[PDB]
Design an enzyme around this catalytic site. Structure first.
Site, short mmCIF file in Angstrom:
data_model
loop_
_atom_site.label_atom_id
_atom_site.label_comp_id
_atom_site.label_asym_id
_atom_site.label_seq_id
_atom_site.Cartn_x
_atom_site.Cartn_y
_atom_site.Cartn_z
N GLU A 1 0.82 -1.20 0.00
CA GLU A 1 0.00 0.00 0.00
C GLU A 1 0.86 1.26 0.00
O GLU A 1 1.89 1.33 0.68
CB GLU A 1 -0.93 0.00 1.21
CG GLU A 1 -1.23 1.38 1.78
CD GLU A 1 -2.25 1.36 2.89
OE1 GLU A 1 -2.28 2.32 3.69
OE2 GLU A 1 -3.03 0.39 2.98
N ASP B 1 9.58 6.69 15.30
CA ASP B 1 9.53 8.11 14.98
C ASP B 1 10.02 8.91 16.18
O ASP B 1 9.56 8.71 17.31
CB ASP B 1 8.12 8.55 14.59
CG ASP B 1 8.09 9.94 13.98
OD1 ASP B 1 9.17 10.52 13.75
OD2 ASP B 1 6.98 10.45 13.71
N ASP C 1 10.97 12.96 17.40
CA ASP C 1 10.73 14.35 17.09
C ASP C 1 11.31 15.25 18.17
O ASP C 1 11.55 14.82 19.30
CB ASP C 1 9.22 14.62 16.92
CG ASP C 1 8.92 15.50 15.73
OD1 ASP C 1 9.76 15.57 14.81
OD2 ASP C 1 7.83 16.12 15.70
#
Lengths: 194, 85
Positions: free
Chosen positions: A35, A100, A102
Protein backbone atom coordinates in the site's frame (compact mmCIF):
# COMPACT_ATOMS: atom_id res chain seq x y z
CA UNK A 1 3.75 22.63 -8.01
CA UNK A 2 6.24 23.12 -10.85
CA UNK A 3 9.23 22.54 -8.56
CA UNK A 4 7.61 19.42 -7.13
CA UNK A 5 6.81 18.07 -10.60
CA UNK A 6 10.39 18.71 -11.69
CA UNK A 7 11.70 17.01 -8.54
CA UNK A 8 9.67 13.87 -9.24
CA UNK A 9 10.74 14.14 -12.89
CA UNK A 10 14.51 14.30 -12.59
CA UNK A 11 15.84 14.09 -9.04
CA UNK A 12 13.96 11.63 -6.81
CA UNK A 13 15.58 8.14 -6.98
CA UNK A 14 12.62 5.93 -7.85
CA UNK A 15 14.81 2.93 -8.69
CA UNK A 16 16.53 2.81 -5.29
CA UNK A 17 13.24 3.10 -3.37
CA UNK A 18 11.71 0.37 -5.55
CA UNK A 19 14.75 -1.89 -5.10
CA UNK A 20 14.75 -1.51 -1.31
CA UNK A 21 10.98 -1.83 -1.08
CA UNK A 22 10.89 -5.01 -3.20
CA UNK A 23 13.94 -6.56 -1.47
CA UNK A 24 14.81 -8.27 -4.77
CA UNK A 25 16.06 -6.91 -8.12
CA UNK A 26 13.14 -8.65 -9.87
CA UNK A 27 9.73 -7.14 -9.02
CA UNK A 28 7.85 -9.29 -6.52
CA UNK A 29 4.71 -9.34 -4.38
CA UNK A 30 6.44 -7.11 -1.80
CA UNK A 31 5.85 -4.23 -4.25
CA UNK A 32 2.72 -5.05 -6.27
CA UNK A 33 0.74 -5.78 -3.08
CA UNK A 34 2.19 -2.95 -0.97
CA UNK A 35 0.00 0.00 0.00
CA UNK A 36 1.05 3.57 -0.81
CA UNK A 37 -0.60 6.82 0.30
CA UNK A 38 -0.26 10.15 -1.51
CA UNK A 39 -0.98 13.46 0.24
CA UNK A 40 -1.86 16.30 -2.14
CA UNK A 41 -1.43 20.06 -1.84
CA UNK A 42 -5.22 20.50 -1.68
CA UNK A 43 -5.33 18.25 1.41
CA UNK A 44 -6.71 15.15 -0.33
CA UNK A 45 -5.42 11.79 0.89
CA UNK A 46 -5.64 8.65 -1.26
CA UNK A 47 -4.72 5.26 0.20
CA UNK A 48 -4.36 1.72 -1.15
CA UNK A 49 -2.08 2.82 -3.99
CA UNK A 50 0.36 0.27 -5.38
CA UNK A 51 2.94 0.01 -8.16
CA UNK A 52 4.01 -2.98 -10.24
CA UNK A 53 7.35 -1.69 -11.57
CA UNK A 54 9.77 1.22 -11.42
CA UNK A 55 8.26 2.69 -14.59
CA UNK A 56 4.68 2.41 -13.31
CA UNK A 57 5.91 3.93 -10.04
CA UNK A 58 7.35 6.85 -11.99
CA UNK A 59 4.32 7.43 -14.21
CA UNK A 60 1.81 7.25 -11.35
CA UNK A 61 3.82 9.43 -8.96
CA UNK A 62 4.60 12.06 -11.61
CA UNK A 63 0.98 12.13 -12.80
CA UNK A 64 -0.56 12.45 -9.33
CA UNK A 65 2.19 14.90 -8.26
CA UNK A 66 1.71 14.58 -4.47
CA UNK A 67 3.52 16.81 -2.00
CA UNK A 68 4.57 13.68 -0.09
CA UNK A 69 3.82 9.97 -0.15
CA UNK A 70 4.00 7.47 2.69
CA UNK A 71 4.85 3.76 2.66
CA UNK A 72 2.43 1.08 3.80
CA UNK A 73 2.71 -2.63 4.48
CA UNK A 74 2.71 -5.70 2.26
CA UNK A 75 -0.78 -7.11 1.76
CA UNK A 76 -1.96 -10.48 0.48
CA UNK A 77 -3.82 -8.77 -2.39
CA UNK A 78 -3.00 -5.69 -4.50
CA UNK A 79 -4.23 -2.61 -2.60
CA UNK A 80 -5.10 -0.74 -5.81
CA UNK A 81 -7.73 -3.45 -6.34
CA UNK A 82 -9.35 -2.67 -2.97
CA UNK A 83 -12.69 -1.55 -4.44
CA UNK A 84 -13.12 -5.04 -5.95
CA UNK A 85 -12.57 -6.78 -2.60
CA UNK A 86 -14.41 -7.05 0.69
CA UNK A 87 -13.00 -5.05 3.59
CA UNK A 88 -11.96 -8.21 5.45
CA UNK A 89 -9.87 -9.56 2.56
CA UNK A 90 -6.99 -7.04 2.58
CA UNK A 91 -4.79 -8.43 5.36
CA UNK A 92 -1.49 -6.76 6.23
CA UNK A 93 1.37 -9.26 6.21
CA UNK A 94 4.76 -7.54 6.48
CA UNK A 95 5.98 -4.03 7.18
CA UNK A 96 9.41 -2.73 8.05
CA UNK A 97 9.52 -1.87 11.74
CA UNK A 98 9.63 1.89 12.29
CA UNK A 99 10.35 4.40 15.03
CA UNK A 100 9.53 8.11 14.98
CA UNK A 101 11.57 10.65 16.94
CA UNK A 102 10.73 14.35 17.09
CA UNK A 103 12.02 17.51 18.74
CA UNK A 104 8.52 18.15 20.15
CA UNK A 105 9.23 16.26 23.38
CA UNK A 106 12.52 18.10 24.06
CA UNK A 107 11.31 21.72 23.96
CA UNK A 108 11.31 21.73 27.77
CA UNK A 109 15.09 21.19 27.83
CA UNK A 110 16.42 23.28 24.91
CA UNK A 111 17.15 27.00 24.72
CA UNK A 112 19.09 27.13 21.44
CA UNK A 113 15.73 26.93 19.59
CA UNK A 114 12.13 27.88 20.57
CA UNK A 115 9.01 26.41 18.90
CA UNK A 116 9.52 24.83 15.44
CA UNK A 117 13.27 25.64 14.96
CA UNK A 118 16.27 23.32 14.81
CA UNK A 119 20.06 23.61 14.66
CA UNK A 120 23.13 21.48 15.35
CA UNK A 121 23.00 22.31 19.07
CA UNK A 122 19.53 20.86 19.63
CA UNK A 123 20.15 18.01 17.18
CA UNK A 124 22.34 16.38 19.84
CA UNK A 125 19.16 15.19 21.58
CA UNK A 126 18.08 13.40 18.41
CA UNK A 127 21.62 12.11 17.82
CA UNK A 128 21.66 10.52 21.27
CA UNK A 129 18.19 9.15 20.48
CA UNK A 130 19.48 7.32 17.42
CA UNK A 131 22.58 6.23 19.34
CA UNK A 132 20.62 4.59 22.16
CA UNK A 133 17.98 3.14 19.82
CA UNK A 134 20.59 1.67 17.45
CA UNK A 135 22.52 0.19 20.37
CA UNK A 136 19.30 -1.44 21.57
CA UNK A 137 18.38 -2.91 18.18
CA UNK A 138 21.88 -4.19 17.44
CA UNK A 139 22.79 -5.65 20.83
CA UNK A 140 19.42 -6.81 22.22
CA UNK A 141 17.39 -7.59 19.09
CA UNK A 142 20.19 -8.46 16.66
CA UNK A 143 18.79 -6.40 13.79
CA UNK A 144 21.25 -5.38 11.08
CA UNK A 145 19.53 -3.53 8.21
CA UNK A 146 18.17 -0.38 9.82
CA UNK A 147 18.59 3.14 8.47
CA UNK A 148 17.55 6.53 9.81
CA UNK A 149 15.96 9.12 7.53
CA UNK A 150 15.62 12.82 8.35
CA UNK A 151 11.98 13.80 8.83
CA UNK A 152 12.39 17.08 6.93
CA UNK A 153 12.27 19.63 9.74
CA UNK A 154 13.49 18.36 13.12
CA UNK A 155 12.87 14.60 13.37
CA UNK A 156 14.23 11.24 12.28
CA UNK A 157 12.46 8.05 11.18
CA UNK A 158 13.86 4.57 11.78
CA UNK A 159 13.30 1.80 9.24
CA UNK A 160 14.25 -1.72 10.32
CA UNK A 161 14.08 -3.92 7.22
CA UNK A 162 15.39 -7.14 8.78
CA UNK A 163 13.37 -10.11 7.57
CA UNK A 164 12.55 -10.91 11.19
CA UNK A 165 11.52 -7.29 11.79
CA UNK A 166 9.30 -6.98 8.71
CA UNK A 167 7.14 -9.96 9.67
CA UNK A 168 6.68 -9.04 13.35
CA UNK A 169 3.03 -8.89 14.38
CA UNK A 170 1.31 -6.01 16.16
CA UNK A 171 1.84 -7.40 19.67
CA UNK A 172 5.53 -8.06 19.03
CA UNK A 173 5.97 -4.53 17.67
CA UNK A 174 4.26 -3.19 20.78
CA UNK A 175 6.57 -5.29 22.94
CA UNK A 176 9.68 -3.90 21.23
CA UNK A 177 8.24 -0.38 21.55
CA UNK A 178 7.54 -0.62 25.29
CA UNK A 179 10.96 -2.22 25.64
CA UNK A 180 12.64 0.84 24.15
CA UNK A 181 10.11 3.36 25.54
CA UNK A 182 11.45 3.70 29.07
CA UNK A 183 10.05 7.23 29.51
CA UNK A 184 6.35 6.43 29.20
CA UNK A 185 5.32 9.65 30.98
CA UNK A 186 6.63 12.71 29.13
CA UNK A 187 5.59 15.45 31.57
CA UNK A 188 8.40 17.42 33.24
CA UNK A 189 6.40 18.33 36.37
CA UNK A 190 6.55 14.87 38.00
CA UNK A 191 9.27 12.43 39.01
CA UNK A 192 9.70 9.43 36.73
CA UNK A 193 10.42 7.16 39.72
CA UNK A 194 11.71 4.44 37.41
CA UNK B 1 20.72 -15.03 52.57
CA UNK B 2 17.64 -17.17 51.95
CA UNK B 3 17.25 -15.56 48.52
CA UNK B 4 20.90 -16.26 47.69
CA UNK B 5 20.55 -19.88 48.83
CA UNK B 6 17.43 -20.32 46.70
CA UNK B 7 19.12 -18.69 43.70
CA UNK B 8 22.14 -20.99 44.00
CA UNK B 9 19.85 -23.99 43.52
CA UNK B 10 17.56 -22.41 40.92
CA UNK B 11 17.99 -23.40 37.29
CA UNK B 12 17.29 -21.00 34.43
CA UNK B 13 15.94 -21.32 30.89
CA UNK B 14 17.51 -19.80 27.78
CA UNK B 15 14.99 -19.00 25.05
CA UNK B 16 14.03 -16.18 22.66
CA UNK B 17 12.50 -13.05 24.18
CA UNK B 18 9.77 -13.26 21.52
CA UNK B 19 8.16 -16.08 23.52
CA UNK B 20 8.63 -14.13 26.78
CA UNK B 21 7.47 -10.65 25.71
CA UNK B 22 5.00 -10.37 28.61
CA UNK B 23 7.79 -10.97 31.12
CA UNK B 24 10.09 -8.68 29.11
CA UNK B 25 7.80 -5.67 29.36
CA UNK B 26 7.89 -5.88 33.16
CA UNK B 27 11.68 -6.41 33.42
CA UNK B 28 11.09 -9.83 34.99
CA UNK B 29 13.56 -11.61 32.68
CA UNK B 30 17.23 -10.93 32.02
CA UNK B 31 18.16 -10.62 28.35
CA UNK B 32 21.39 -10.97 26.39
CA UNK B 33 21.87 -10.99 22.61
CA UNK B 34 18.21 -11.69 21.92
CA UNK B 35 17.84 -14.50 24.48
CA UNK B 36 15.75 -14.41 27.66
CA UNK B 37 16.90 -15.93 30.97
CA UNK B 38 13.78 -16.89 32.93
CA UNK B 39 11.69 -17.14 38.16
CA UNK B 40 10.97 -20.01 35.79
CA UNK B 41 8.56 -21.71 38.20
CA UNK B 42 6.25 -18.71 38.06
CA UNK B 43 6.23 -18.93 34.26
CA UNK B 44 5.52 -22.67 34.22
CA UNK B 45 2.86 -22.14 36.89
CA UNK B 46 1.13 -19.38 34.91
CA UNK B 47 1.16 -21.32 31.65
CA UNK B 48 -0.19 -24.35 33.51
CA UNK B 49 -2.92 -22.24 35.07
CA UNK B 50 -3.98 -20.72 31.75
CA UNK B 51 -3.86 -24.03 29.89
CA UNK B 52 -5.79 -25.68 32.72
CA UNK B 53 -8.44 -22.98 32.60
CA UNK B 54 -8.88 -23.43 28.86
CA UNK B 55 -9.23 -27.19 29.28
CA UNK B 56 -11.70 -26.63 32.11
CA UNK B 57 -13.88 -24.56 29.80
CA UNK B 58 -13.62 -27.28 27.14
CA UNK B 59 -14.79 -29.96 29.58
CA UNK B 60 -17.62 -27.71 30.73
CA UNK B 61 -18.68 -27.47 27.10
CA UNK B 62 -18.62 -31.26 26.65
CA UNK B 63 -20.21 -32.16 30.01
CA UNK B 64 -23.85 -32.28 28.73
CA UNK B 65 -22.60 -35.25 26.72
CA UNK B 66 -21.31 -36.80 29.96
CA UNK B 67 -24.52 -36.43 31.97
CA UNK B 68 -25.99 -39.52 30.28
CA UNK B 69 -24.16 -42.12 32.45
CA UNK B 70 -25.82 -42.76 35.81
CA UNK B 71 -22.84 -44.01 37.83
CA UNK B 72 -20.77 -40.82 37.56
CA UNK B 73 -23.09 -37.88 38.21
CA UNK B 74 -23.89 -38.63 41.90
CA UNK B 75 -20.18 -38.91 42.62
CA UNK B 76 -19.43 -35.69 40.76
CA UNK B 77 -22.24 -33.87 42.55
CA UNK B 78 -21.00 -35.09 45.94
CA UNK B 79 -17.38 -34.03 45.38
CA UNK B 80 -18.50 -30.76 43.79
CA UNK B 81 -20.78 -29.75 46.67
CA UNK B 82 -18.44 -31.20 49.29
CA UNK B 83 -16.50 -27.96 48.88
CA UNK B 84 -19.25 -26.40 51.05
CA UNK B 85 -20.75 -44.36 80.79
Amino acid sequence: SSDMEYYYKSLYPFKHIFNWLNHSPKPSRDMINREFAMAFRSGAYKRYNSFNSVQDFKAQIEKANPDRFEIGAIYNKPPRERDTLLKSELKALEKELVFDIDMDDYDAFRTCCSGAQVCSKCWKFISLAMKITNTALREDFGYKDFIWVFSGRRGAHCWVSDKRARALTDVQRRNVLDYVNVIRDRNTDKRLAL
Amino acid sequence: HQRKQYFQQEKFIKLPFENVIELVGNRLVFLKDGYAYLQQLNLLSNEFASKLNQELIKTYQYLPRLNEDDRLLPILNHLSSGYTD
